[PDB]
Amino acid sequence: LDEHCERLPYDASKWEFPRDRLKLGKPLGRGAFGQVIEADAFGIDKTATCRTVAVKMLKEGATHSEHRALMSELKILIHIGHHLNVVNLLGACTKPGGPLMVIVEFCKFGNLSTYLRSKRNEFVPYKVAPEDLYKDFLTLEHLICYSFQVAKGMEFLASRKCIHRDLAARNILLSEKNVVKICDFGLARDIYKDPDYVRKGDARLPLKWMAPETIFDRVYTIQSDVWSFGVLLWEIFSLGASPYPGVKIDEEFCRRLKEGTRMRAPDYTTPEMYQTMLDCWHGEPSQRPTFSELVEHLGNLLQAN
Numbered sequence: 254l255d256e257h258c259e260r261l262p263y264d265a266s267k268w269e270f271p272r273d274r275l276k277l278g279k280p281l282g283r284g285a286f287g288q289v290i291e292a293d294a295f296g297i298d299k300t301a302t303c304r305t306v307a308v309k310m311l312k313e314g315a316t317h318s319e320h321r322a323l324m325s326e327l328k329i330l331i332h333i334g335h336h337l338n339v340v341n342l343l344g345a346c347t348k349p350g351g352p353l354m355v356i357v358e359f360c361k362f363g364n365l366s367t368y369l370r371s372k373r374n375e376f377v378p379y380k381v382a383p384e385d386l387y388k389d390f391l392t393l394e395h396l397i398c399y400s401f402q403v404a405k406g407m408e409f410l411a412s413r414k415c416i417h418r419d420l421a422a423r424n425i426l427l428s429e430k431n432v433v434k435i436c437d438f439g440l441a442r443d444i445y446k447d448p449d450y451v452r453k454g455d456a457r458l459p460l461k462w463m464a465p466e467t468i469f470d471r472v473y474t475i476q477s478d479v480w481s482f483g484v485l486l487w488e489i490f491s492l493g494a495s496p497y498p499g500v501k502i503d504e505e506f507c508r509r510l511k512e513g514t515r516m517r518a519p520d521y522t523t524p525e526m527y528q529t530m531l532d533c534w535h536g537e538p539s540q541r542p543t544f545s546e547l548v549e550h551l552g553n554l555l556q557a558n
């Protein structure tokens with residue numbers, strides 16, 4: 254349903270937020286045409302209550318084309334609706350006389366890739382008593398829990414007849430109480446400056462996260478998102494490392510992938526988590542597990558840990 258966003262409704266009576274009730278703060282991230290800014294919203298969700306929020310909007314360089322694209326994003330977010338494991342829509346500023354602003358929940362710890370890399374040194378597979386009891390270290394339980402939460406958010410997205418198309422640790426945010434949320438920075442990330450995006454024809458694509466049918470046939474489905482989820486699991490159990498270490502991402506890489514060549518196990522995985530990665534990387538899309546099947550499997554592993 255996310256391929257024909259323009260026909261979806263925008264109910265202003267429900268979502269419109271007055272610009273004079275939003276106090277803009279410091280930028281969080283910038284792209285070539287879009288940006289994310291921290292802000293304080295007065296009464297966006299609870300009467301007369303100040304709340305820190307994140308705002309996606311355009312910047313110098315954007316044109317009417319990017320303005321149309323951001324309005325389509327707002328319409329699809331309303332259709333999708335809310336879930337604990339997605340970055341949720343709170344309101345929007347669309348009235349003439351100012352910029353289009355899409356207001357979402359603030360996630361204080363930022364992206365999961367940087368977070369896990371920053372905490373790599375503190376990791377312990379299992380917390381052993383007594384010295385570790387009052388220390389806030391990352392454990393195998395935390396990593397399986399983040400994996401389970403992302404599968405729940407993706408199962409929810411699939412139920413709304415939508416697909417992600419850029420699933421990766423850089424597009425997962427961490428909030429309070431160990432809650433992780435799927436997001437899409439889109440225009441607010443500078444893909445022409447980012448090493449995770451490689452030139453392929455004319456566009457800059459996230460080659461290291463793409464299923465072979467996406468690379469070779471330009472096919473995007475919920476099952477190509479399952480392949481990307483497999484790459485995301487490798488990022489989690491490597492504690493924020495970059496995929497395919499030391500491999501040149503060229504014509505040769507794509508051919509080896511198409512023939513069945515795969516990544517080796519990351520340094521902090523369990524045998525069952527590595528087998529889950531291999532299952533998400535089946536060459537045949539219909540033979541990869543579904544997000545509903547991954548939710549069941551990871552829920553059972555989390556309880557077993």
Ligand SMILES: COc1cc2ncnc(Oc3ccc(NC(=O)Cn4cc(C(C)C)nn4)cc3)c2cc1OC
Binds near residue numbers: 282359360362
């Ligand atoms: C402490 O640092 C940050 C905190 C942040 N907190 C919150 N948002 C941040 O950036 C944003 C990222 C994305 C979006 N927009 C979307 O995700 C739209 N969307 C949602 C969906 C669902 C899958 C259904 N698909 N698309 C809006 C803001 C933060 C950035 C930070 O630093 C760089």
